[PDB]
Amino acid sequence: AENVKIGVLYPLTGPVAQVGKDAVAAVQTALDIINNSHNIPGMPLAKDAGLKGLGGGKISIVVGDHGGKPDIGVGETEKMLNSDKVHAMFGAYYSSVTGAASQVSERAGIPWVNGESTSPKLTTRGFKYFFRVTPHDGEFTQLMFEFMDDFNTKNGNKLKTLGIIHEDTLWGADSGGTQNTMAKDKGYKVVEKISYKAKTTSLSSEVQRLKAKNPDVLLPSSYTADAYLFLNTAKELDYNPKLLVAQNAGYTDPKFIATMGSKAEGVITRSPFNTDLATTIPMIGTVNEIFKTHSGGRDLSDVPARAFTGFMALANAINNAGSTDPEKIRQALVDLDMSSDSLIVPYRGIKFGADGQNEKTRGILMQVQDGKYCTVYPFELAACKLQYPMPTWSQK
Numbered sequence: 001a002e003n004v005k006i007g008v009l010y011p012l013t014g015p016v017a018q019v020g021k022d023a024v025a026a027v028q029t030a031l032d033i034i035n036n037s038h039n040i041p042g043m044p045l046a047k048d049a050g051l052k053g054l055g056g057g058k059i060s061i062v063v064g065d066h067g068g069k070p071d072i073g074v075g076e077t078e079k080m081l082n083s084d085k086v087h088a089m090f091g092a093y094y095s096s097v098t099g100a101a102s103q104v105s106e107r108a109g110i111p112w113v114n115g116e117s118t119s120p121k122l123t124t125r126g127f128k129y130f131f132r133v134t135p136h137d138g139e140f141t142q143l144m145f146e147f148m149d150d151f152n153t154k155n156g157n158k159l160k161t162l163g164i165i166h167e168d169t170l171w172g173a174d175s176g177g178t179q180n181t182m183a184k185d186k187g188y189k190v191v192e193k194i195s196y197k198a199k200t201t202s203l204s205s206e207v208q209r210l211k212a213k214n215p216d217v218l219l220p221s222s223y224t225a226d227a228y229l230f231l232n233t234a235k236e237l238d239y240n241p242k243l244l245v246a247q248n249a250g251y252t253d254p255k256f257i258a259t260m261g262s263k264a265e266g267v268i269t270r271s272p273f274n275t276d277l278a279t280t281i282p283m284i285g286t287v288n289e290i291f292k293t294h295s296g297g298r299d300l301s302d303v304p305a306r307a308f309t310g311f312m313a314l315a316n317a318i319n320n321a322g323s324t325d326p327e328k329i330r331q332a333l334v335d336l337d338m339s340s341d342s343l344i345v346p347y348r349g350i351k352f353g354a355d356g357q358n359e360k361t362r363g364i365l366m367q368v369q370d371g372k373y374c375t376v377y378p379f380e381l382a383a384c385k386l387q388y389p390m391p392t393w394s395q396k
């Protein structure tokens with residue numbers, strides 16, 4: 001009977017704090033399912049109290065607030081490795097932070113599982129100890145363009161021009177770059193490609209430029225505070241894009257709609273998760289009920305669903321390893337091949353390629369309609385019709 005300790009790094013203060021708090025609540029939800037005995041058909045690890053592979057040993061976590069700062073994330077990772085002696089790492093939301101921190105654990109030879117950082121570059125580093133469960137922005141951008149192509153075929157090929165606007169750290173830069181490359185390859189004309197700092201107090205120059213150019217599709221990659229600033233500024237300058245397809249995250253912050261209210265109407269984002277999938281995936285309801293007891297009564301959303309899924313992958317790998325030895329955990333992650341049966345996201349399973357990326361991911365697009373995100377794509381998996389054009393400020 002052997003316990004295991006995992007380090008968990010997220011932003012728990014600052015502009016994206018609710019993201020981090022709800023992610024940690026999701027991990028705590030997983031720990032509740034793992035460490036206690038639960039009757040949940042279809043969910044590995046539920047029935048046993050603790051991991052059968054560790055003789056009933058319990059998982060514990062040590063949690064660090066990195067504040068969105070890569071250098072802090074690096075320092076916290078070092079302390080978790082060297083002082084806390086964690087046997088695996090989990091985190092860390094921001095691609096910038098995940099990249100920097102996972103380089104430390106890589107060199108230490110300690111497995112790092114990521115639930116929700118989407119820079120494509122994180123899995124092209126030649127690493128051996130890094131495993132990512134979320135789709136990355138290559139996959140999510142592919143989905144955006146499949147949607148634009150299908151809309152085009154149905155609507156006279158009227159979506160011709162794109163405006164890309166992105167925050168300037170790893171995630172936003174790679175997101176915007178992925179979109180730009182794919183645009184060029186698919187014949188779409190990029191008429192703005194704007195980089196900005198997430199901590200900026202003004203986006204008025206950027207919004208003026210986008211309004212003047214008036215792209216057919218607006219493609220923002222923003223964190224929470226900057227997403228709010230962007231939308232507030234757009235309203236203030238009466239900038240009315242007809243289609244806004246966001247790379248999540250600010251647009252999937254747990255409190256995005258609560259904060260923005262009618263300002264969010266018509267916005268589209270990519271996601272692997274929506275509660276309107278629960279008739280197709282009833283496990284969502286089961287886990288949601290448990291999550292509420294950890295989240296202060298708030299429902300699952302994108303980031304907690306992804307973090308929960310990621311942490312379950314790690315837990316299952318440890319169980320399968322029958323060991324807390326970091327090398328055996330790594331090998332169990334290499335060997336992992338989970339079906340979709342236990343999942344709360346519409347992935348086909350969890351199975352990593354040689355680059356550490358989950359091969360079985362899948363995403364959706366969802367649109368704010370009447371105060372809730374609703375699945376709109378693919379057109380076969382949709383809870384409602386796309387609203388196009390987006391309402392103008394005066395109509396929201």
Ligand SMILES: O=C1CC[C@@H](C(=O)O)N1
Pocket residue numbers: 093094095096116117118119171248249
């Ligand atoms: O899907 C997401 C959430 C955070 C952001 C990133 O990788 O920084 N992408």
Ligand code: NA
Pocket residue numbers: 032033034035036037038045046047048049050
């Ligand atoms: Na259990």
